Symmetry: D2
């Protein structure tokens, strides 16, 4: 091809800009034009398309968010919506599309590929639950955002006020919670992929206080429930003064870490490789520390899993 | 004197360790022994007191929290508890005491003063609400913690969700909200020291969205109310989707900034000087960029104010 | 005035964008148009001037550098260049100018007013070497960039690698080295405003080694000499393995701190006020924690000093 | 086993503490005692050994450096030193040893196991140059320390100073330069394991300047040469004013990132598994995103490689 497109969909994820830059620079390296599609599939339908020159991706590698923005598009979840998008692409001479985002963005890539239009998905989300990849672009940064709060809370502990609950992001996936929990020394970590007994949790807390543990940190995935509630719940059971922090959308913002920028650079470039090799209808990723790509439809068929051993370890280390 | 003591009281505040380091090193420079009193006034009464060698304040200048710990002491709001405190100090040959902390800590210093025991209060709290000083040790660091969040939230904006409420600490004082609001480009800042009108808050918000402002950030001092309630009010009046972050006790943690460390170092040393100069019942601070000290009880009678011109400015810049 | 201008000159400084935002928003608040002048005085002469809208300073408050750029303009140090700048200001309808920069940029401000253009100077530099102001915009941020380095070095000490030299910026002023050094717990701070003796420096190293100090940290202002040279002289003199960091232009970069964003906002706005008050040939600053403005020539005739007490304190605390 | 020991050796690496914590807590969980050996093998030989209790590794997970300290020991490279080391182990009833560090530490582990003393190596260094692992503990943190510096330099690019050399660590290994280069959008990266030619470096500089690239960032691995030297060469050849940053031991310092803490936690715990299950003469690692262990002698026989595709990619993208 002579001309490709690029968009971002889903919530913002640190590293999207690193991925947009990789896509533009890799394409341009092979003499291919790249056109930016703004506001995701909404902007595609609306015709928000503009050429991205080599310098237009300068000074964005280190920047959070996305210069192409992100928007919801229930219209594109329909055939009338998909139809107008293909029209806008044909109109601007765009022969393939790189889509960067979450579970949502991949369905649109699937549907465009079903309608014969070459499209490759790039995993851009903080929650780590996109198939075809061990890690999504944004996950590493979000974990470092979480542990920055955990580390500050460790300075604020007292003998009376020593129990803390932190509510982290992750729709449906416990990856942020598990990994940030391990990295932050959390005693208890509540995730959708592992059963928890609140009595087992209360016992742990009392055993730790009894042996002189300065403080206890409990991490709660938003997909298990509310931390504000687990906080109230733990107080009146144990009598222990419990402070709850709800981190929220700070977890999607910030400059990406080194790994997120590298992952983004490598996966963006691979998305372009696939489109130029005439291999649309795929998604890219890293698996077992190797770059990979898969059919989107097959990849999406896979259920998300977490490392149960890591969950067990985190319990062991926090005695 | 041959020997003095130091302790920390109130919540944790970044720079408390830089303060402790300075009291210890300044005293030792003049050939005076220093004894740490652990757990604030509670450990004072309990006799939780241990000599600090030169020695023991190494590699703490950059560390958040307090190595001496902080605790609550209702007992020390009583004559009986003050006398047990003075007896433990005598018991250990401590001739003067430096108290680093909040208003709680100052009240005890005034009481020890009424009792004839030389004490100097040093302002260690994040909320800036201590008299005899323009700035308290921990305040600058907290501002930077708040703006880290605000900055990350900017990257998160969409058309869908462009309206954000952040609830910051402050207790009764709007300093953290005012200063972090201005630094963060907050559209509205709700503080105890200045009236607000919710319809004017709503009017500015729509006026901003109109003229294409990418997002509105609203900062709420916890002493004004709950971010959750304000975000609801705003979502229910405008229809705009409103996301609330409540930062919490993360604000009291972290490594202190340069300014907090400098201030802590200067005020700590100055506090020891006053003891050795034969004073007591003073509190130290920085006012008009000069080091100052004042009678504790006189200072405590002053009401806290904020810069109202800065508040007006913050409004003017967010159009 | 119907229309003013704003430019940045000298080196980049954290908070230049906050100051530009404030000038633009403060002018626009009062019904005044604001035109951006790109590339400093060079751009003024070349006519690189573009109106700035309310939203053009959206999402810059938190960014380092300057969206207007800076360039060196020798053409402006002479009388033909200056009046070049003048035809371009009249051609674009610009009745007054805010110059955000260092010392050199003020000179152009002075000369311009004489030719009937009110100009107000705003202090934007990391060096802290401008008269009429206790602090310059970017200084606090530079200090926190330096202590970041010092803090990390504190983790790295061993028995053999125990002595560290870090070279900091500041031009001919010792403020960065002094304040960084106090905040970072430096044992020796070499600055142009204070005598030092390499024997005493070496005496201090040995005293610290003999008493069990884990490491010794040496801060060298660039105005005094080369960190690499000092490090090598220490290792040659003592046999002590000495490690050298030279931070360089990193100190001019990064997101401004809370204090730099506030000072930038207050000072930028003040400049616009002066222009609308009918004043010109002034520069703004903060002195004794109060906003001030001075005649540019008067201000420039003053000599910059550091606080010798803070220098002596740094000695006394690092025993 | 009923007693093991743990030790740190080589330069400090962010995450060594997380690893120490993991070894202590994993052992204690299985009812095994852990003794800390202070100052590496030097301290082992001197008998600088002290029981580590559950809580003694409290509040270290998030801390840079090593609480056990690190020291050089050439004597441990001799038969006598191995003899005296084993005598101290036996005297203290230590039945196996975990060594956390670099090559020096692994050679010591090999020798120990040839002397029939069980020992497991854990990879702890910033430079990623340890066999049996794709990543060493500290590498990811060091990368983030480097890009902080690169990010800040991006803010400072003037028109007459837009060429920057940054010297990074990695003697022998180009991993830091390569990964931080790619993550940082470096135009040129000089590493030991890929060929460079100054003619290409200068051509690339000029080629980017003509196209309107705002700045050129050159990353030089210290194993290739001196940044100060390369900077001079570039300035002298091109007349482009070139500025130089040598970060130095800053790269070994700071709080570990999430990935380093997770890696340290998983690898420390595995070392304990091997010792308790009667293994020894092994090292642990993560390869292809899977926890692995190897015979130390076999792993040491492997040459270090970097990913050549990543290097090629870094050039493609920085046009």
């Amino acid at each position: 091809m002579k001309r490709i497109g690029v968009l971002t969909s889903g919530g913002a994820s640190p590293g999207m800009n690193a991925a947009i830059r990789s896509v533009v620079r890799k394409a341009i390296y092979h003499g291919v034009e790249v056109y930016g599609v703004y506001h995701g599939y909404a902007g595609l339908i609306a015709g928000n398309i503009k050429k991205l020159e080599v310098g237009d991706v300068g000074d964005i590698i280190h920047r959070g968010g996305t210069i192409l923005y992100t928007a919801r598009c229930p219209e594109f979840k329909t055939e009338e919506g998909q139809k107008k998008g293909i029209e806008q692409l044909k109109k601007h001479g765009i022969e393939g599309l790189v889509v960067i985002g979450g579970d949502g963005s991949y369905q649109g890539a699937k549907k465009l590929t079903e309608h014969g239009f070459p499209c490759v998905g790039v995993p851009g989300t903080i929650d780590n639950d996109i198939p075809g990849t061990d890690f999504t672009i944004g996950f590493d940064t979000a974990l470092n955002t979480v542990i920055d709060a955990i580390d500050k809370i460790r300075d604020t502990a007292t003998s009376h006020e020593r129990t803390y609950v932190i509510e982290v992001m992750g729709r449906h996936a416990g990856d942020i919670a598990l990994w940030s929990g391990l990295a932050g020394g959390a005693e208890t970590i509540l995730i959708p992929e592992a059963d928890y007994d609140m009595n087992d949790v209360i016992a742990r807390l009392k055993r730790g206080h009894e042996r002189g543990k300065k403080h206890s940190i409990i991490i709660v995935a938003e997909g298990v429930g509310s931390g504000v509630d687990f906080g109230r719940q733990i107080q009146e059971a144990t009598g222990f003064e419990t402070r709850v922090t709800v981190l929220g959308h700070v977890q999607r913002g910030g400059s990406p870490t080194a790994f997120d920028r590298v992952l983004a650079s490598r996966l963006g470039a691979r998305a372009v490789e696939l489109l130029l090799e005439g291999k649309g209808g795929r998604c890219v990723g890293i698996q077992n520390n190797q770059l990979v790509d898969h059919d989107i439809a097959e990849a999406l068929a896979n259920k998300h899993t977490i490392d149960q051993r890591m969950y067990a370890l985190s319990k062991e280390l926090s005695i």
